[PDB]
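Ticket #4471: complex job returned nothing on first submit. Input attached below:
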Amino acid sequence: GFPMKQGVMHPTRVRLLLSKGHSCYRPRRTGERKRKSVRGCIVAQDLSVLALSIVKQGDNEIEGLTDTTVPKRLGPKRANHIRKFFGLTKEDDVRDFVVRREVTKGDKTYTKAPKIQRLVTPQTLQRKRALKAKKVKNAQQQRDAAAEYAQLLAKRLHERKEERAEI
Amino acid sequence: ARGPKKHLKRLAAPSHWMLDKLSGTYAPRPSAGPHKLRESLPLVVFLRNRLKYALNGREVKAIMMQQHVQVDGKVRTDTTYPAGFMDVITLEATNEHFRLVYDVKGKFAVHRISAEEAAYKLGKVKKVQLGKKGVPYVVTHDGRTIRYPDPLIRANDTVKIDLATGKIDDFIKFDTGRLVMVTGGRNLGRVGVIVHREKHEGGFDLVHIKDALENTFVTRLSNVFVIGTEAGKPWVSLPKGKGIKLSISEERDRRRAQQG
Amino acid sequence: GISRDSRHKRSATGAKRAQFRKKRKFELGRQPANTKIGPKRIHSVRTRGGNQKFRALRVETGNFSWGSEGVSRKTRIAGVVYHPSNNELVRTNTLTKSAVVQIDATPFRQWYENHYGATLGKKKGGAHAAHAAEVADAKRSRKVERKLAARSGAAAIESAVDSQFGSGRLYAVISSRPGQSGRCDGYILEGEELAFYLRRLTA
Amino acid sequence: LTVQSERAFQKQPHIFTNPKAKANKKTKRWYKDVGLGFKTPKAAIEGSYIDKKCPFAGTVSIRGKILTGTVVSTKMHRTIIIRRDYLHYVPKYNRYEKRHKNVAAHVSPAFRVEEGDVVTVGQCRPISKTVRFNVLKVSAG
RNA sequence: GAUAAGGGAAGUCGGCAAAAUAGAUCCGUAACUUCGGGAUAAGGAUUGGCUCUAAGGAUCGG
RNA sequence: UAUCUGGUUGAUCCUGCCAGUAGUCAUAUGCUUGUCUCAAAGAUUAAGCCAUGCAUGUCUAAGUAUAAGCAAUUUAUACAGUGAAACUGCGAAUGGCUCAUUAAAUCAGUUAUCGUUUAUUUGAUAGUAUACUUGGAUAACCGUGGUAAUUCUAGAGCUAAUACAUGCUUAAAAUCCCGACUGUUUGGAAGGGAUGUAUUUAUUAGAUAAAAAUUUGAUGAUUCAUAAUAACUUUUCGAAUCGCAUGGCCUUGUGCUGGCGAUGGUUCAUUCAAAUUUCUGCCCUAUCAACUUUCGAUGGUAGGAUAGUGGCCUACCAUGGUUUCAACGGGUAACGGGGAAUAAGGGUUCGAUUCCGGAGAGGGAGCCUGAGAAACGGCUACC
RNA sequence: CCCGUCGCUACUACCGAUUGAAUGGCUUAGUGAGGCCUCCGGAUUGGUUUAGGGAACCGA
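Support reply: We reran it on our side without changes. The output follows.
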């Protein structure tokens, strides 16, 4: 039952220190590594199963693989994924082409539609306006504060000039 | 040991909190913030043990989640916020304002203040130096930094901070004759006047002080806090007692004068 | 791993100490970089506080300063000629701080020729003197002629530095810490420091 | 006692002497005032020795404890060990016993020390395995 | 006169015979002792080739 | 309460111990045991071994929902409520337990960081010389499964972001450099480059002895803060994020504007902390008198390494360092202190254990992750 | 009154062939697991992107 792993140049089992990212291991804690037994990538007679993917269909069909189809489970959800799925240009309202699966409950059947990410609304533009407005306003207040400090420094400087010119 | 501590044993809590011995194993550990863990007063203590408004900590969290409590004009949702010296506590729903000021006994007494005085706070200047872009700033005793301070403000001076804007209203120079309050040591809470500042380079600066009743008492410069320009004229309201120390016989006599 | 604790040492009296705890992570050390001259290869190290160091494994070029002229250029390290700590570092061409190196003098030559309108090296070579004479008189406007004329006087450099420019390789000392910052920077050797290192090199 | 007696050139870091400005052909020398009422010895200001561990012509600061003691060895290079005699009180017998400590201290070339001398040392950062103190004043003995 | 898997004196009156050790440099070396020894005790490490570097001199000339 | 009594003789006065007497936040044990309050409790020997169950998880209106989940027909055919799973974030370094190791070590009181790192909190803090908003994976889910067995997981098919990786939206002038031409006794210029903050290096500011032949912060103290010039960089970051309300302006354009918050992010300060650190102070032992320096011992110079100082390590050099004022070695049925009992005074003895500090997780060692661990209710190896 | 040897019994410790035995610590020498750094390497993989079919060419 030990899985085959890419890169292990062996027809036999090896023992590897697996970390985040390696196949055949799902880490349970951040930074955790385990040493696990895996099977090499070279196919030999000691294998219980051999996973295969059809690359080309030659002359005949197959009982439940080549003669049938299964639909995809979900459709696009990000805005530009929908646009590239239907070839839509950057003018069409993406909201009215969203796939909507049908859910039944007794008789009050209805549709479930994916929420779209990265979709521009008045709220998003409102936030983009607000951030820049805050930056500019902040710069104005900082310039005012520096100007006031300069005026205070100048007043002290000149009153000091005349105060030491009295003595 | 491997990282920061998060609990506080009850017997290890500061002695000015007046915590009973037997209520439980632990005491509220004040959060990180504007005041030292040992010299602060967590809000749960102030609203449960002092004001007696809340009966228990869970009620303190019920109170503070509804924006009721403010410190220095800002709503705090931290049950263990490190409120300290001069901090203004405001309870809007009861329309009631407080300032944490030491009493002569060495405790954060419960001091009701008016709404007009609950609009600023004093602050002792710890250091001044230039920041980024050549901008000078001062640091107060509550970790507040103020940019563009008056060219004359130096260490140990006190600035009058406007709570709404965080700006400096006016400041008091540290010199002989200043009304001060002692913020550490044996003489915690006692109000006096500066008589002589004694300097020791590399070591510790001592400050001779005198009460309204002429008793002279010396204290480390680090424990002094300038609170007024001259005798009898502070810039904040004083606790009931005026910061004056009484002998044990005197307090016995006054207790038997108001209860017998 | 490598530990920087002092508890593993003997006492100042010579006494042997007993172990007090296991090794701590806050007292670790790491392997030396041993930076060589070669195509750039810089590795990153995550350090205490989540900070980040860069370990120069190989570097080609560096930022070098001409102190008496107030200009710094990015030039090419040619090799190591002297190292006070260990001559094996010279032998293997290991770049650390304080190593004495030769760098390409080209960018500094361009700067000086453009700035003072003169030449460096004093080598009347066959094809060298052609370049020198051409640099002497070029296509050049009049206000720039005057600014160069004002810049003369402060145009001659010391003889020891000048004599090197005929080779295109100037002596220099590394000032950065390549194993730490990931960079190999330095300054041109001049003055009695240059005289001292020339005396050492001639042996 | 030539300054340049090492593999590496002895220099004060970041004190640049320009070989091009004009005459006064001597290297500029940096020094500081240690404070706490100690005077900079003349050999520090007009001297030529390079010592990064010197309190006056070096990068180490004086802060912390100030000690005094008798010099008992000058057999290391630029380092001495001084003896600090004292009296320990034993309460049970209402009496004292004689005790001593040996302290290793850096000695700058600006001073001259011989065995049998009393010196004042100020505390600096660790500058050796055993050295945490640095000579600031030498009294002939 | 040689070699021999695994074992290693079970052979034999008996380790007979044979094997094992072996030069030099460095390290380390017990009981006991007539204080001289025991001692190469015991027992460890090193060793080629090539290209270099350093130290150890003689006679002249103030 | 500053106290004694019995015992050697036929009898006596002594020395001298034995015995008596009282206490123990001092243990065990025997007998006995009605009531209320309070309250220690597998330390001692075995830091011996452990069946089994539990002891660390966590979602707000404000990161990611097409659950083939429940509910609503209501403000809604892009989603909108409630709500498993899973991705993301944080915590899991606190706590609790124990006393094995440990004798200048721990620890106590005092110092130092002008010798450093610091999540978070709290203050400040950035206009920098495709944009009505970029990509393409992947989990959950469906389906095919392999192993006796594990909190094992593999093919294959979809699909998100505050995950991953990229990327513009910006002021006004002024300053420095090169400088085609040109005016010509030293000037005007076209045309180019550089301006923020991070990194690295070099070089300049960062001031102050009083009479004839020009202004600058802090410190006891600095090469401090800060500013400037020249460049440098596998170019740090100066918001492609979320929830509520949605108002105002008319040159009505799906225009321009803008309120309260969430989460972010650079630097400094602050707070919570760490790491090193000065001075002085430990029980018994000489049937331990010399110890350390081969292979760092003491110091010097340069480097490497570290968050940073330092023989911490390396290279070269010198021959130093401790000791009868007891080093070094050995023992401890030794974790240290706050404290406890006794107590005229002076002392004697106890302190594993309610608090503080240290150390460990069967024994060693090595690490990942992370601000923080040499973590063990984390990993790796050996016994 | 009293001394020592001798006889019976009991207890404690000492010496002692056994190159005796065990437990704990330190350690020379030889072997040496596993991390970490480093050096190549290159199952696989996306395109620094360009190929009339893809042909030169980059990143993980």
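Chain B touches chain D at residues 201-202 (CB under 8 Å). Closing as resolved unless it happens again.
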